Structure 1
Amino acid sequence: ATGRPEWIWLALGTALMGLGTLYFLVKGMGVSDPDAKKFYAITTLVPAIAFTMYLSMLLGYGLTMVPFGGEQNPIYWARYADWLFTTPLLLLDLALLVDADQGTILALVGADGIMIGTGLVGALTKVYSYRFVWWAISTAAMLYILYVLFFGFTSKAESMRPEVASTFKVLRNVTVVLWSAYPVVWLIGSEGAGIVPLNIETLLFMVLDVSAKVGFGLILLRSRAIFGEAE
């Protein structure tokens, strides 16, 4: 409904995830290389899931009211349903690019699950001061992920094919900068201190989400690093 001022950004987000899904879908037709097919499958699913959850927030299904600080506070819980399934897939794109081992993949996906899950608990907590305890644990799990992407993945990438290493380093830098903004927006927005209003908070997440999913995919899927070395 248009009674919520943030609706314009939810509608724009819905449209851009939908167009991004359609573009990757058609671009992925004809790809027969089995390696490339993995990356197209992982990367096309990411905006498709986000499309459905931006639509649920636009129509009002993905919104709940949570009492804290005396007031009833609108909390879009569908963001966490979105991020639970899309953030592991983005990490898989990076780990498959560098041929990460299985133990490291499991550690990354597990820390990511702890990240989003404790962020969800913090979003729905009724005692104000406890919301920030959960924010801190979630941020600690994120810092572990960022550490592994630098001091574990970067070291191996330098020992692989040059195009793999070069594409990895670009996507790593994009991920580190964009993921690090998310905890800041939560802390000063309606889920945390309440300094920035919800309509502006929704704009900022919309720009971060499209850049981290559609922009990330455009860089990856235009690279030759996703094809096997063939003659």
Structure 2
Amino acid sequence: EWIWLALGTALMGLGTLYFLVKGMGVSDPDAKKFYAITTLVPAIAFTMYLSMLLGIYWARYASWLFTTPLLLLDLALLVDADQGTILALVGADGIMIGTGLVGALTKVYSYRFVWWAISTAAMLYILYVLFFGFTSKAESMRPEVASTFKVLRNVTVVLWSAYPVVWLIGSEGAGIVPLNIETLLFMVLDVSAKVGLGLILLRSRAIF
């Protein structure tokens, strides 16, 4: 279990460093914003993972709290989504993470179920907007933006959907997956979402 944590920490740190240095050689005002958000996300995750090493799993949850909104923001900026749409997405993200926590704080099965159903419903709304709403918006934009968004979209929807699955079969849920393995799964997901997506985004001309 300690290894996945050390691994996660290292991968997040290197991802952050890489995005930071890569961004230095960029001056485009549009590109810089993406570098800002994209570098900040793994920076936040690194801090939390390193913290878990120093210790702890609520720390990882807290990083989800900070990073999910920024990831959504990254996508919103790519398709130049209007403020309202973005606020709604971020608000839904807060509900997702918020209810996930409240459901975790309740001991009675029925309340937990509803809180997490609400959390899942919030995630589904987010995935719907990205997949359907953002896709039409991207297809009316320059080819590079449309193509890069489609890839980020596909990756995002797959990775995000995996979290509740792992959560539901892990120690917070049915208790089928051992803490040891769950930590591994969430680390792979976190790195893929916060370093993998950034790589795809920042290596594209779509940010200019």
Shorter-normalised TM-score: what interval? over 0.9
- Counting only pairs closer than 5 Å after superposition, residues 9-28 of structure 1 correspond to structure 2 as 9-28=4-23
Percent same amino acid among aligned pairs? 99
Q: Runs of 5+ in structure 1 lacking a partner?
A: 1-5, 60-74
Hey, what's the Cα distance between the residues in 2 that align with 1:17 and 1:29? 18
- Once the 2 structures are TM-superposed, how far is the Cα of residue 15 of structure 1 from its aligned partner? 0.8
Once the two structures are superposed, what CA deviation does each residue of 1:123-148 show, in whole Å capped at 9, x if it has no partner?
22233443222211100100111111
Mapped contact 1:185–1:201 kept (Cα < 8 A): yes
Q: Please, what TM-score do these two structures have when normalized by structure 2?
A: 0.96
Deviations 1:43-90 (A, max 9, x none): 00000000010111112xxxxxxxxxxxxxxx7211221011100111
Q: Is the 8 A contact 1:77 1:120 kept in 2?
A: no
Report the Cα distance in structure 2 between the residues aligned to 1:128 and 1:53, rounded to whole angstroms.
29
Larger Rg: 1
Deviation sequence 1:174-226 (CA, Å, 0-9, x none): 00011011101000100111011100000000111101110101100000010
Question: Distance between the aligned counterparts of 1:12 and 1:131, measured in 2?
Answer: 32
Alignment partner of 1:196: what SS?
coil
Q: Distance in 2 between the 1:198 and 1:130 partners?
A: 23
Q: SS of the counterpart of 1:152? A: helix
How far does the alpha carbon of each residue in 1:137-186 deviate from its partner, in whole angstroms, 9 at most, with x for none?
Answer: 10010011111112211111111100000000000000001101110100
Tell me if the contact between 1:131 and 1:192 (Cα under 8 Å) persists in the aligned partners: no
Instruction: Decide whether aligned partners of structure 1 residues 136 and 81 sit closer, same or farther in structure 2, where only a CA change above 3 A counts.
Output: same
Segments of 5+ residues of structure 2 without an aligned counterpart are none
Whether the 8 Å contact between 1:132 and 1:192 is mirrored in structure 2 is no
TM-score, normalised on structure 1?
Answer: 0.87
Q: Distance in 1 between matches of 2:141 and 2:120?
A: 31
Aligned counterparts of 2:3 and 2:60: Cα–Cα separation in 1: 17
Bigger fraction of residues in helix: 2
Question: What's the CA shift string for 1:78-109, capped at 9, x where partnerless?
Answer: 12210111001111111111111111001000
More relative contact order in 1 or in 2 (CA 8 Å, sep 6+)?
2
Whole-angstrom distance in 1 between the partners of 2:46 and 2:103: 24
Q: Distance in 2 between matches of 1:216 and 1:89?
A: 12
**More displaced, 121-130 or 40-49?**
121-130
SS of aligned partner of 2:4: helix
Q: What secondary structure, in the 3-state scheme, does the structure 2 residue paired with 1:77 have? A: helix
Task: Report if the CA contact (8 A) 1:46-1:86 is conserved.
Answer: yes
C-alpha distance in 1 between matches for 2:84 and 2:14: 35
